[PDB]
Amino acid sequence: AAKDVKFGNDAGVKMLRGVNVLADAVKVTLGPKGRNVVLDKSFGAPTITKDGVSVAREIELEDKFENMGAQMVKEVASKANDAAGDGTTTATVLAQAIITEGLKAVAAGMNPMDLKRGIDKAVTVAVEELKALSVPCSDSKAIAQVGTISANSDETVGKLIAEAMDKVGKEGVITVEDGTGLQDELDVVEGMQFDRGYLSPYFINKPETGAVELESPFILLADKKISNIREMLPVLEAVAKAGKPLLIIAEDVEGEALATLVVNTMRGIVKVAAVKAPGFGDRRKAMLQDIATLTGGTVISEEIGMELEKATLEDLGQAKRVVINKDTTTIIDGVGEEAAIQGRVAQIRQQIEEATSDYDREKLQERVAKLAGGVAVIKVGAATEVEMKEKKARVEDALHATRAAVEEGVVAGGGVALIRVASKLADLRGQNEDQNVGIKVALRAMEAPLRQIVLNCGEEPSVVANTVKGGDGNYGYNAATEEYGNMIDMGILDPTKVTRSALQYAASVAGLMITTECMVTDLPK
Amino acid sequence: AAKDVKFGNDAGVKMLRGVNVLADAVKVTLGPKGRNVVLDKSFGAPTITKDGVSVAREIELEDKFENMGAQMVKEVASKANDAAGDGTTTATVLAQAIITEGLKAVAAGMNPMDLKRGIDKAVTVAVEELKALSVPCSDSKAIAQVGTISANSDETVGKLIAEAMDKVGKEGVITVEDGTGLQDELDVVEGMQFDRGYLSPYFINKPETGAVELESPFILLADKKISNIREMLPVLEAVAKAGKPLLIIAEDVEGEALATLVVNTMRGIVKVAAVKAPGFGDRRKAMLQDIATLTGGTVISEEIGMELEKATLEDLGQAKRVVINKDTTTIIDGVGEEAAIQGRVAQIRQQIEEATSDYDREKLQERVAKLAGGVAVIKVGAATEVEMKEKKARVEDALHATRAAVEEGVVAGGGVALIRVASKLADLRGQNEDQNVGIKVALRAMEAPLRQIVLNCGEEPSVVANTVKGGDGNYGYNAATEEYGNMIDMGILDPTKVTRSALQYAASVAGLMITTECMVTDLPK
Amino acid sequence: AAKDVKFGNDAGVKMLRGVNVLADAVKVTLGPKGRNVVLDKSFGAPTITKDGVSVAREIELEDKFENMGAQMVKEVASKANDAAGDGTTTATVLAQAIITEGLKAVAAGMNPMDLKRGIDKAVTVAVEELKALSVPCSDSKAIAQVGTISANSDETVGKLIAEAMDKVGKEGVITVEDGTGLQDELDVVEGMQFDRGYLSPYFINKPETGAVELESPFILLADKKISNIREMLPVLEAVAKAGKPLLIIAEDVEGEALATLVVNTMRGIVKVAAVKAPGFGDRRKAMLQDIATLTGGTVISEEIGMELEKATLEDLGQAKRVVINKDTTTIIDGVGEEAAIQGRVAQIRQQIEEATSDYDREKLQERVAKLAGGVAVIKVGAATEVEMKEKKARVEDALHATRAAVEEGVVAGGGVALIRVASKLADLRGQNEDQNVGIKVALRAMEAPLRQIVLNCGEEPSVVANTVKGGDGNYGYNAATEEYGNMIDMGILDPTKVTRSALQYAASVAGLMITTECMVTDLPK
Ligand SMILES: Nc1ncnc2c1ncn2[C@@H]1O[C@H](COP(=O)(O)OP(=O)(O)OP(O)(O)=S)[C@@H](O)[C@H]1O
Ligand SMILES: Nc1ncnc2c1ncn2[C@@H]1O[C@H](COP(=O)(O)OP(=O)(O)OP(O)(O)=S)[C@@H](O)[C@H]1O
Ligand SMILES: Nc1ncnc2c1ncn2[C@@H]1O[C@H](COP(=O)(O)OP(=O)(O)OP(O)(O)=S)[C@@H](O)[C@H]1O
Ligand SMILES: [K+]
Ligand SMILES: [K+]
Ligand SMILES: [K+]
Ligand SMILES: [Mg+2]
Ligand SMILES: [Mg+2]
Ligand SMILES: [Mg+2]
């Protein structure tokens, strides 16, 4: 269709207008005094929310060029969401502040490529400096503290997460399930988690976690690409009869076969979800086998001349529960016998002795850790169904934050970390004056989150910013009580991982828009 | 003609909009970093100015209700200008701050009369307090200091003003004239100043001072009202022949006769200006006579059966110079002989002995002081015509500030004095909640001048206001260097009188607008 | 009338667009390859010109705000023009370049007052540095050279100007008149020049020089202000009878009397021109007397009780010729006898011995030099009336440039001097970053004149600018021949005084525009 094409400044003003509608809608919800945003729904009451990502999803604009700007900067929240699971609003605030000053510098005649280089240099140094401020979260006391804080001061949840991490290691797999009664339970089951997510968003049966959850499912382990539905028919009907759901772990599920699984789990017919097998090449087969051993299944590979047509319910593996994210599959309580599994471990453990290369060694150690480690299962107890679904959600969130904390530690919240970082970089310089302006654009942007939190309180950003900057270390502003003090002592912490992601994705998308010269869109027609 | 009529809120929003355009245009010029305002002129290059009064005179708005709010608030500046001859921009900023928050309170349902009452109570107490803060300017050291500081640190100008005040008293008449050569000259001549201005603005031959200036003019002293030009004709033509200008001092110059004088000095035909005779009733005649004795003229009064037709050049008085303002006439160097004047002084001095009432005594003492006081003439020396017109202007301005200082003392400049006054009134309460709101409106408005000074620097008004409020006394912000310090030691002082006037005029017009319910104007038609 | 009022950015974009129309019209005519501009006239053929001033005078714009920006910047050309008499196009190109980048720096958020401070600092340093580069023009060889070059390589004209300067000194008075025949004549007559111009442009009888020229006039020397025509009547009629013109040298000629002289020399009735008397105060009377002595006239002062009514043709002085500019009066060949004049000289020369102050000494030496120095008269010979008016024009222009060269010397033309000065200032810094951007603005603008000369040639500005920047000293681009070389050896010189004026008036009006926050004009109605 015929296009509308815009260049330079014409395009920049449209982009900036769109980013501003998006960011301005989102940013009112930042921090403890965030304001509500009302989102219209086609039936019944509108949604009232303080959640950045809910607002951003609804933003689409009529002017097509403004719309492109909103959708580009929206990619900042979702990327920060996917990498750290928090900080999408902080990321949008940082993005609008960089884009705004960046595009003003461009309109003033400064070189967009230098501006970007300066932003990137500041970001690179800011991130090193964030790591140097990060306070580690390594012992179970620290873990329990963070978990307590993330669970709205519920010391129970903190103890639980610390206990789970103590059983499987802070890098171990932990899930949470509904409790059976009043008290919390923590057990370790045979299980495993690997880095593959669902092959279509449609398999998601729980939009609240954006996840796929299956109970007592059969697991098809196919060592090949599935293109034809034909191959599946006999196994699918056999599973239909036992009344259980099916997890397909294949080398891949492509077009035709996937499209059918999507349409057929959509009409309730059979509950099937498909993920890619972990790894690639040689180690892929070995790993498929690890899963087989764990779930008591049998790898159906074309190398031994086995067909999917000639596969019964006995070939399929089984587990009590499987959960799959955008990019994770976790298999909880596999049927595989302790004999077979422990025997498999001993095999791999010997491969480690015969390994003639570090690379092969690490790859093997990873397999053993997954196979011998199992999965911690937190079962959340409560008095009623309602209190339970609620406590479960708190445990899930608290776990998520604590995990982030364990990885890269914690830094002062309320946007003080980025403010301290920016002041350590006052002397940072680049190769020329435009790069220097770029550096300053990014240092200035780093105050935006603190300023917006203050603004949402009804206080003066410039006064609070200036006061915070005039102290040091963990001194900042507690926006819930409206007092200054030590952020760590007050329990206002951000996982370093979230702060670092929000900054990095903000600067990344911003540097793409600051170096955009031309925009192409359909004619409004 | 048909009227448009608005009430309540509809009226309030129009008034506020009008005030805002006027105040916004004027306030950019405030203080050392005031910005330029460009004023269009129908011929040649526009006027570029940093002077509030120049801006304010040009403002007139299309919408007739908005225009009414601009013109009501302009009354602030012009009355502060008439009373204290400085501070009109400060006055305009205080007025906008009061009006803005007062009208918001009204829109919120608070009682306008209580708001006004609260504002008024605050202003009353603020003015007592500004007198307590005020530092006297009474001795000739102080007067030289203030003069020096108002002359851009020119100690020469400070010495001259102190010398002139030492000759004629700090309440005596002082003028400045062009020097004859390189050095300054101070002499005392016979002369007098009285509280009557021109009878039409059209006599103004020097729009730069808004004044009327006449050189070696004849002075007609007529003890009656002049309605007919007929009477004047014979005296007017006799004056026309001598080639000198004429000052008419009559009991009044009404309609017909005035209209003619206006038209005839307009076409350059004869240079004539008219003022009312000073005082009223009995003392008016005796005062007319004092002027006569001073200028060597003869009172033409109808009580002795004298006509204006039978008056020659010999009857008229004379002086080297007369200057007339909106509400002052000053006669410089009258021809009257020292014998006659000194003899008249002695007469009045005896009347003071015979006086049987305080009131008659004081009135008589006033006359003697004027007749015996003379007029100090400062002649400004310089190397070139350009340097002299410049140094003359500095002396004029310094003289004007010093006079104000001598009446009411001096306080910290840079808006600090009103901030110190506000903070002392934090506990001030009225009869009810609305009145308390009124008080707060006024105390908040008292910050506005410091804030606007700061904003014109390009700095952050809330940060500086916060810092200055955290200090005390004379601590404040020097907007020329951008440093904090002691306002007095840094030489940044305002005459108390100008601070007081700005505030009282601002509050006065703001209270009228806040209690306005209805506006009537012509239909745009 | 009702006003339109604009603020900030809305004002800045209007200003800028009006400056661009004006400067774009003017700048095409810069340099040896300047292009033609066609100016409509209401009757007959349009005017075709390469003269910037001519273009500027016609520029008026419909949008009242853009018109204000044109009229402001036109003040640059006319102030350069009054101070130096050349360089107005250069000055307009410098202003456009400073305003353009200065308003873009404001739009980007930079503090206008700091921007202006930076520009002023660069200009102040640039001017010092121009002085350091200036090659003197002090001996008569250099004077002849510069004369020759300013006269389109006419060595004749150069010799003449050098001979005239040799007779009366390089600071002496020199005029040019029509020759009587074929050869040039140079003689020295009794005469004098003083710093007072005409009191109205209407006395101009020669619009080609914008000058007033009077032949064998009477000279009224009145030591007082003339307000009334009455006083003049008897002297005016006495002059009317002798059939000669009259020059009025009074303390001033104000409103009424001036308006009449304007109207009466306008209808051909009597040829009268009026100028202020030189100096002020005491030395004014002494100086009035010097003129009297020179012209054989008699001072009519009111201090000795003399009237203008009682003045005959015998009281008036006389001279063969007088010429009056916007700000100069020159009296050529006064009738005064050598006895009286030489005797007056001896008097003053004694005052110099008795002088007890340097100031009084210099003032006296100035009077002797004027009275004893006379006036060099260049009479231009030619073969026909046409060739003579033409040669006379060349001599006038050459003289004017040579005089400018003698005061402050000469620098490389072609915009090279400013480019050399800009590169010496690369390290110049101010108090903050916005001041530094200011400095850069001004250094970038200093390339504009060379780049616009180049652009007028149809060559590439950046290539030429870069090549000139890469050499040094007087290396530049000869835009007549399109070759690089040594600008001084090629004879492409600018008087330092014109380059300095152009740059200072440009920066001065540009700094006012940059710090303009608000504009007020009549509603288009
Ligand atoms: N008492 C507090 N005082 C100041 N800041 C706080 C306080 N409590 C939490 N915060 C800060 O609030 C910010 C988090 O606000 P949120 O509203 O969750 O937005 P976000 O995490 O940036 O984006 P979402 O949640 O993905 S939408 C973090 O910087 C916290 O440090
Ligand atoms: N260095 C300074 N720092 C802060 N304030 C100053 C400084 N110098 C003068 N001022 C203040 O600036 C204010 C005077 O500003 P102006 O521009 O004259 O306007 P104004 O008197 O209120 O109104 P005008 O002159 O009639 S228009 C006073 O409050 C001074 O004390
Ligand atoms: N051959 C040349 N090559 C380069 N520049 C030259 C040459 N001859 C003269 N110029 C320069 O041209 C500039 C002057 O051009 P003009 O057109 O007179 O403009 P202006 O003097 O800037 O403005 P006017 O005359 O008052 S309109 C000076 O910079 C001269 O040095
Ligand atoms: K939120
Ligand atoms: K001002
Ligand atoms: K030209
Ligand atoms: Mg969050
Ligand atoms: Mg003032
Ligand atoms: Mg020229």
Curated annotation (Swiss-Prot), chains A, B, C:
N6-succinyllysine occurs at which residues? 33, 50, 116, 276, 320, 389
**MF term (GO), any:** magnesium ion binding
Magnesium recorded as keyword: no
The known regulators of its activity are described as: During the substrate-folding cycle, the two GroEL rings separate for effective substrate binding and chaperonin activity. Ring separation is triggered by ATP binding to the trans ring of the asymmetric GroEL:GroES complex and avoids formation of functionally impaired symmetric GroEL:GroES2 complexes. Activity of the GroEL-GroES chaperonin complex requires Mg-ATP. UMPylation of the chaperone by SelO/YdiU negatively regulates its activity, and may facilitate survival under stress conditions.
Q: Which InterPro entries match?
A: Chaperonin_Cpn60_CS, Cpn60/GroEL, Cpn60/GroEL/TCP-1, GroEL-like_apical_dom_sf, GROEL-like_equatorial_sf, TCP-1-like_intermed_sf
Modified residue N6-acetyllysine is at which positions?
A: 116
**Record keywords:** Acetylation, ATP-binding, Chaperone, Cytoplasm, Isomerase, Nucleotide-binding
Reactions that this protein is recorded to catalyse: ATP + H2O + a folded polypeptide = ADP + phosphate + an unfolded polypeptide
Cysteine-cysteine disulfides:
none
* Modifications the protein undergoes after translation, according to the UniProt entry: Phosphorylated reversibly during heat shock. Can be UMPylated on a tyrosine residue by SelO/YdiU, probably under stress conditions.
Q: Report quaternary structure and partners.
A: Forms a cylinder of 14 subunits composed of two heptameric rings stacked back-to-back. Interacts with the co-chaperonin GroES. Can form asymmetrical complexes, composed of one GroEL and one GroES, and symmetrical complexes, formed between one GroEL and two GroES oligomers. The asymmetrical complex is the functional unit. It was suggested that the symmetric heterooligomer may represent a transient intermediate in the chaperonin protein folding cycle.
* Cited PANTHER family: 60 KDA HEAT SHOCK PROTEIN, MITOCHONDRIAL
Domain notes per entry: Each subunit is composed of an apical domain that binds non-folded proteins and GroES, an intermediate domain and an equatorial domain that binds ATP and is involved in inter-ring interactions. Forms a large central channel that appears to traverse the entire length of the cylinder with no obstruction. The central channel of GroEL functions as two cavities, one in each ring, that are separated from each other by the crystallographically disordered 23-amino-acid C-terminal segments of the seven subunits. The entry and exit of polypeptide seem to be restricted to the apical end of each ring. Modulating the volume of the GroEL central cavity affects folding speed in accordance with confinement theory. Small proteins fold more rapidly as the size of the cage is gradually reduced to a point where restriction in space slows folding dramatically. For larger proteins, either expanding or reducing cage volume decelerate folding. A stepwise reduction in cage size results in a gradual loss of cell viability.
What name does UniProt use for this protein?
Chaperonin GroEL
Q: Which organism is it from?
A: Escherichia coli (strain K12)
* Name of the encoding gene: groEL
